[PDB]
């Protein structure tokens, strides 16, 4: 039907009934429905009053010659009878997420882990037409049939954050393809593919660079804070940066060792851990400075890299 498009396994339908909604770029069908029973429509109020809407012809766009609004059969009057409201086609949000969450759009991902990706989007035109997905190689060729995994190229409205094929969204297995930057193209099934109804989501495939760490300075004195950055990691997962207690000053205390790593940047928790238990900065309950053996700071990543910091104060001169 119309308004429930996937209920009949149809990618589109153009049989408009009275009171439904119509979008800018549609091409109404003149068969049974409100396309032969009432082909001439006139505006009701606002900027659309008096203006006519010819359903037997394709509807113009960019809000010119067809103002948005409710349309009567009589125009601005005392009749509320076969009826059309004219909206605009829109794609609001769209993301590429891994099998366990984590947006990876516009960011390089490892070829090994790029095997259970998902594509999701939110679009305004759900009653009229579904939105297609078309993966394009950097050379510019349709590779969709090679990488498609399920959902039949049609992604439903909503379903953002759906990590399973049960919900709306299409899975692509981009593991077999070589390294490069790829573009995912979303557009309407038949007609709604112009501006603001289509979006190109890019994706970079490259060899898995192992975790990379860099420092803004290598030769520093005590007391000078140093910022460390973690590079080339999977988004949404928690790394652990460790600190050997042998490098710590011998005259340090329990509370003196839990502040080597700062809460600066994306750091989540700081403290000192042992093979059995851990002593975080929240309380001095776990191992003591002599009891513990490692100082750590669990850090997440947002994008391609995350930044933390250290306090070179109370560190051995070595």
């Amino acid at each position: 039907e119309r308004g429930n498009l996937d209920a009949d396994s149809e990618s589109f339908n153009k049989t408009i009934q009275s009171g439904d909604r119509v979008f800018l770029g549609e091409e109404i069908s003149t068969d049974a429905g409100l396309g032969a029973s009432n082909p001439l429509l006139t505006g009701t109020a606002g900027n659309s009053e008096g203006v006519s809407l010819d359903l037997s012809s394709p509807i113009p766009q960019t809000t010119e010659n067809q103002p948005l609004g409710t349309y009567d059969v009589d125009g601005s009057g005392s009749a509320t009878t076969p009826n059309v409201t004219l909206l605009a086609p829109r794609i609001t949000d769209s993301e590429i997420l891994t099998s366990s969450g984590g947006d990876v759009t516009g960011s390089a991902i490892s070829s090994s882990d790029a095997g259970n990706l998902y594509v999701n989007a939110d679009y305004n035109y759900e009653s009229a037409e579904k939105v297609e997905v078309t993966v394009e190689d950097p050379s510019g060729t349709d590779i969709t049939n090679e990488v498609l995994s399920g959902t039949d190229t049609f992604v439903d409205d909503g379903s953002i954050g759906s990590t399973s094929s049960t919900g709306g969204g299409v899975g692509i297995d981009m593991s077999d393809q070589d390294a490069g930057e790829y573009t995912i193209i979303l557009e309407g099934a038949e007609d709604l593919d112009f501006g603001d109804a289509t979006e190109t989501m890019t994706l970079t495939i490259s060899s898995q660079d192992e975790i990379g760490i860099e420092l803004d300075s290598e030769s520093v004195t005590q007391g000078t804070d140093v910022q460390y950055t973690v590079t080339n990691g999977i988004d949404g997962n928690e790394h652990v940066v460790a600190m050997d207690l042998s490098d710590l000053q011998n005259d340090a205390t329990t509370e003196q060792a839990k502040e080597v790593f700062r809460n600066i940047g994306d750091t989540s928790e700081v403290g000192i851990a042992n093979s059995s238990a851990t002593n975080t900065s929240g309380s001095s309950t776990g191992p003591t400075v002599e009891t513990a053996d490692i100082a750590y700071a669990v850090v997440e990543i947002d994008g391609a890299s995350a930044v933390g910091g250290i306090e070179t104060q109370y560190l051995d001169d070595s």
Partner: protein, 158 residues
């Protein structure tokens, strides 16, 4: 030399076996190179060393050791293979050749001069399951794309 043949529009697949091609194009295919770099020259028994090399056309590679007989497989560990990047280069972390478990490592334990070589996934259990689990002979190792280099083991030091 490899050729591609096109056929006129509207022709069926079965009926196109005999009719001549409207046009054609030919390309040449050659075999790539798979060599090792770091496990060469000298090796202290019991020490750990990385696996360094290149592989132009490869997906999975295996390391074999030979001494007066069969090429005994060396059990590197996970999946017995190393992936290759886009730069046609494959690498592995520091691995103790003699330390690892397997009969392949046992040959290298004793002091002497031996041979070590790498081979692509063309073996694939010399026909069968998709896993490198055999001890390929001289003919089997040489038939596929591979390369070997002389290695000798030196006793420990301090």
């Amino acid at each position: 030399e490899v050729d591609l043949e096109v056929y006129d529009a509207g022709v069926s697949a079965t009926a196109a076996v005999g009719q001549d091609a409207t046009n054609d194009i030919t390309l040449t295919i050659e075999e790539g190179g798979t060599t090792l770099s770091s496990p060469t020259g000298q090796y202290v028994v019991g020490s750990e060393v990385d696996i360094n090399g290149t592989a132009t056309s490869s997906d999975s590679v295996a390391i074999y050791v030979r001494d007066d007989g069969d090429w005994q497989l060396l059990e590197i560990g996970g999946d017995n293979e190393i992936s290759v990047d886009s730069d046609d280069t494959f690498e592995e972390e520091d691995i103790a050749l003699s330390g690892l478990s397997g009969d392949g490592s046992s040959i290298l334990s004793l002091t002497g001069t031996y041979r070590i070589g790498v081979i692509d996934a063309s073996d694939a259990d010399v026909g069968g399951d998709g896993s490198v689990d055999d001890s390929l002979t001289t003919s089997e190792f040489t038939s596929g794309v591979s390369s070997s280099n002389s290695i000798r083991v030196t006793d420990q030091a301090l």
